[PDB]
C-alpha cells in the first residue's frame, strides 16, 4: 500500500551488562511485532505511519538514554533488494 | 554528483571479547575513510561505486565470519534528513 514504509532500527547497547541484555530482549520483542531481527541489534520493520509512531514511542521508553541509543532510518521506497549480508547469521551463562 | 551513494554499514560484533574489540577498531578506521561513526558499530558512508567496492572488500576481509556480520544498505537517494537519533552519542580496562 501507498501508506507503507521501510524502517531500519539500529540499537547501540552493550550486552555484556545485565541491564543491556534485558533492554535488548525488550527492544527485540517490540520490533518483532513489526518485522525481522537481521543482526543482534538491527531490526527491519515495514510499517504505516501510525505503527511507526507507536513503535518509536515504545522503543524510546525502553532504552537507557545515558548508556544506549537508537537510530531510526526511513528508507526511500525500494522494491528490489539493496542489502548485502556478510558473515554469520544472528542467534546459559557460564564461567 | 550523480555517481554518489548513501551507504549504511551495520557491524554485529561483541566487544566484550579481545578479538571483537580489535576488529571493531579496524572496521571503524576503514569506514572513517568514507564517512562518520554514528553509533559504536554503525557507519554512514557517502561513496561512489569504486569506493564502495574497495571499502566492502576491505571490510569483508577484516571480520571474523564465524562470529561477526556486516550488513551494507544502499539507501535510495535522499536530500533531507530521514534519521532520528534517540539517546546517547557514541564514545582503560579496569576490574
The two beta strands, B69-74 and B83-87, are unpaired
Interface test with A, best of B71, B74, B80 (most A CBs within 10 A): B71
Range of the domain at B36: 1-95
Quick check: B76 and A78 CB within 8 A? Answer: yes
Scored b (16 or more CB within 10 A) or e, B19-39 reads ebeebbeebeebbeebbebbb
Set of cell numbers at residue B66? 564465524
The domain total for chain B is 1
Q: For B40, phi and psi rounded to 5 degrees? A: -55, -40
The DSSP-derived string for B15-33 is TTSHHHHHHHHHHHHHHHT
CATH number of the domain within which A81 lies: 3.30.70.240
**What SS3 state is found at B18?**
helix
In this complex, is the C-beta atom of A19 within 8 Å of any C-beta atom belonging to chain B? no
Looking at the DSSP bridge assignments, the partners of residue A84 are B72
What single DSSP character describes residue B88?
Answer: P
Amino acid at each position: 500500500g501507498s501508506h507503507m514504509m521501510l524502517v531500519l532500527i539500529t540499537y547501540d547497547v552493550q550486552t555484556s551488562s545485565m541491564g543491556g541484555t534485558k533492554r535488548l530482549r525488550k527492544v527485540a520483542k517490540a520490533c518483532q511485532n513489526y518485522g525481522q531481527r537481521v543482526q543482534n541489534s538491527v531490526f527491519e520493520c515495514i510499517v504505516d505511519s501510525t505503527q511507526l509512531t507507536s513503535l518509536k514511542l515504545e522503543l524510546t521508553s525502553l532504552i537507557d538514554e545515558e548508556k544506549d541509543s537508537l537510530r531510526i532510518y526511513r528508507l526511500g521506497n525500494n522494491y528490489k533488494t539493496k542489502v548485502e549480508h556478510i558473515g554469520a547469521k544472528p542467534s546459559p551463562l557460564i564461567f
